[PDB]
Structure 1
Amino acid sequence: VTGDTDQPIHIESDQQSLDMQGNVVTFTGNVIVTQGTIKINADKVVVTRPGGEQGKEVIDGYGKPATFYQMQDNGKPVEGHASQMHYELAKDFVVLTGNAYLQQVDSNIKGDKITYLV
């Protein structure tokens, strides 16, 4: 009974590292990523920050648990697993890779990787 695209990306973990000349982040230890109804979970994430663009940075997650879950009020859960995941800021691209699996009311697929957009 709340929005998911309505809410900011919440992130937490126990290691955090940045470099302004390396232009890159590290987080480490059970990284939890959430927005409203969406739950996404890894052990590490990577993001390159060029700067000069604004909002073209991408959030590449890896290491177990490497799981996705969502619950809609509209009787529509969806959940899945992989080894590696690409997540992003608005629509830009999405893919799950390494033993990827996904299930929903009108949708059932599994393999090395799943093709599905935002």
Structure 2
Amino acid sequence: VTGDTDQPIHIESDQQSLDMQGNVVTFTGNVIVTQGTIKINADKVVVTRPGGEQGKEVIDGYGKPATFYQMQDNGKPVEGHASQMHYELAKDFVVLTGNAYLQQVDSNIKGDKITYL
């Protein structure tokens, strides 16, 4: 894959409910957010967009245990899971909530209410 985050994110959903203005794009019905070799699985994802700026919305999804699975390109398989997941292109902070367990190659961030300082 070389660079996952360097590639355009794909939100695979069964229900695409796009607001007429674009204020909110609702993704429901088992959503598979894939990025390179990363495969996130949620049930309800709410992407809000004021309208105009593209490439930086807000990957906010919850419902089914949002797992962070990745194919072992380095031989080491990535594994993670939480109740709520969050990813952003600018805010490079994985904010998970509810049984939040995530490790990159060896470790990352784990707990439940992932909060910083």
Relative to the length of structure 2, the TM-score reads 0.78
Give aligned pairs, total.
Answer: 117
Comparing 41-50 and 102-111, the one that deviates more: 102-111
Relative to the length of structure 1, the TM-score reads 0.77
Shift in Å, 1:77? 2.0
**Structure 1 segments unaligned to the other structure (5+ residues):** none
CA distance in 2, matches of 1:58, 1:29: 19
CA distance in 2, matches of 1:56, 1:8: 11
Shift in Å, 1:52? 5.0
CA distance in 2, matches of 1:98, 1:3: 29
CA distance in 1, matches of 2:77, 2:115: 19
Bigger Rg, structure 1 or 2: 1
Shift in Å, 1:20? 3.0
- Greater than 6 Å deviation, 4+ residue runs: none
CA distance in 1, matches of 2:24, 2:114: 27
Shift in Å, 1:2? 4.4
**Structure 2 segments unaligned to the other structure (5+ residues):** none
Q: Deviations over 1:35-70 (max 9, x none)?
A: 211111101111221135444411101110411112
Q: Deviations over 1:5-24 (max 9, x none)?
A: 34321222222212234711
Shift in Å, 1:90? 4.7
Counting aligned pairs with the same residue, the percent is 100
Q: Deviations over 1:49-108 (max 9, x none)?
A: 113544441110111041111234223321111000111235543211111112355427
Task: Go from structure 1 to structure 2 and tell me whether the alpha carbon gap of 1:76 and 1:111 turns closer, same or farther (over 3 Å shift).
Answer: same
2:22·2:49 contact (CA, 8 Å) conserved in 1?
Answer: no
- RMSD over aligned Cα, in angstroms? 2.9
